[PDB]
Amino acid sequence: GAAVTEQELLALDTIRPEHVLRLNRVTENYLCKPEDNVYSIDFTRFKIRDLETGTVLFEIAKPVDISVGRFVRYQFTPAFLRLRTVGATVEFTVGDRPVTGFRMIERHYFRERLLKTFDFDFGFCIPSSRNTCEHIYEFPQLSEDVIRLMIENPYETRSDSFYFVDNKLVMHNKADYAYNG
Amino acid sequence: GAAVTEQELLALDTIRPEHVLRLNRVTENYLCKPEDNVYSIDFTRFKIRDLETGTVLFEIAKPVDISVGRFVRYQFTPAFLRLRTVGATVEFTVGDRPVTGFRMIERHYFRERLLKTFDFDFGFCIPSSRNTCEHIYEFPQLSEDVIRLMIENPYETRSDSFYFVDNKLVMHNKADYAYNG
Ligand SMILES: CC(=O)N[C@@H](CSC/C=C(\C)CC/C=C(\C)CC/C=C(\C)CCC=C(C)C)C(=O)O
Ligand SMILES: CC(=O)N[C@@H](CSC/C=C(\C)CC/C=C(\C)CC/C=C(\C)CCC=C(C)C)C(=O)O
């Protein structure tokens, strides 16, 4: 199907996975509100491994309770862009409502250029508890020119992560990235 | 001056402190982009004290470099709403550009009701280093009805924090709050 705009999706009754898969630019604004996370999904830890070498690259964890939402800025080193197969172990809590079809679509762009879409299922989740999921990211094979542009233009690589439960958008996190660490 | 809308501010060449002081609702969307933080301000730690008792209430710190931006969700206990004078010690780094007039305007709302505006100056900042500032929040004297509504309706209390450097908006962080911890 043809490309859709951020403004078109905001006018819909419900945003479905198939709809965000036709966005052709990273969004400017968010496509849902914090209060749409009616399942209280809260990411608490992720551990990132290079699956070719088995090396743990890094682990990020949450340090009155706070939930960081909506936006993360990452600065990586240039070798990050040379990875091929990266495993993410993602820990998260969920609230008291049962979750079905928890699905994540991530779209990564350098400026206006889509680099890669990832579309993962989270699997079965126990309510009111910590849950864990492993995702395997097969990185795009980036050209040398694109790699150079991404290193030279920090934070112009950006992503949208759209999280669905039962085919309805419930969370939308954004990020930008540099590779000049 | 009369109230301004989020859409009116987005149409301006530059958003000034006086402009956000006339918003009469928490914003739906952000009034600047991540890339507008051309000073690379990154909050790294804050320590919150009840200044009446001297008690440290809590400290939040950041755990490849990441910067959490744009949105934090807080869950406090109901006693938080009874505080009167709260000291925040805020640690942050700044990039290589010199900073002048670093100013923060925070507006806190329960639903559509403005509870309090805070307007603080950060003082002088050394580029390319960690900086610290102390702010003193004089909490509004909330009615018992408002306190009850805020406890009973988690995450319907929301804030905008608008950060200015040299009278131009450079960061806009948002939060929502519960008081039923
Ligand atoms: C509030 C917020 O935003 N929470 C974030 C982080 S918590 C959930 C963590 C997840 C889903 C793991 C994210 C995976 C990684 C960081 C590994 C690095 C791989 C990439 C950045 C893709 C690389 C793509 C290209 C090179 C084109 C989020 O929702 O993700
Ligand atoms: C990305 C992001 O969002 N970073 C956040 C947190 S880093 C800077 C920390 C600051 C400015 C300290 C914030 C102060 C507190 C948390 C103390 C609690 C006081 C209140 C919540 C006001 C209470 C108001 C009423 C009861 C009406 C931000 O920019 O703030």
From Swiss-Prot, chains A, B:
What do the Gene Ontology cellular component annotations say?
A: ciliary transition zone
Residues in the signal sequence: none
Q: Drop me one GO molecular function for this one.
A: lipid binding
**UniProt key word Isomerase:** no
Tell me, what is an example of a GO biological process annotation in this record?
A: cilium assembly
Q: What is known of its domains?
A: Adopts an immunoglobulin-like beta-sandwich fold forming a hydrophobic cavity that capture N-terminally myristoylated target peptides. Phe residues within the hydrophobic beta sandwich are required for myristate binding.
Give the protein's biological function. Myristoyl-binding protein that acts as a cargo adapter: specifically binds the myristoyl moiety of a subset of N-terminally myristoylated proteins and is required for their localization. Binds myristoylated NPHP3 and plays a key role in localization of NPHP3 to the primary cilium membrane. Does not bind all myristoylated proteins. Probably plays a role in trafficking proteins in photoreceptor cells.
Q: Subunit structure, briefly?
A: Found in a complex with ARL3, RP2 and UNC119B; RP2 induces hydrolysis of GTP ARL3 in the complex, leading to the release of UNC119B. Interacts with NPHP3 (when myristoylated). Interacts with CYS1 (when myristoylated). Interacts with MACIR; interaction only takes place when UNC119B is not liganded with myristoylated proteins.
Q: What is this protein called?
A: Protein unc-119 homolog B
- Protein's organism: Mus musculus (Mouse)
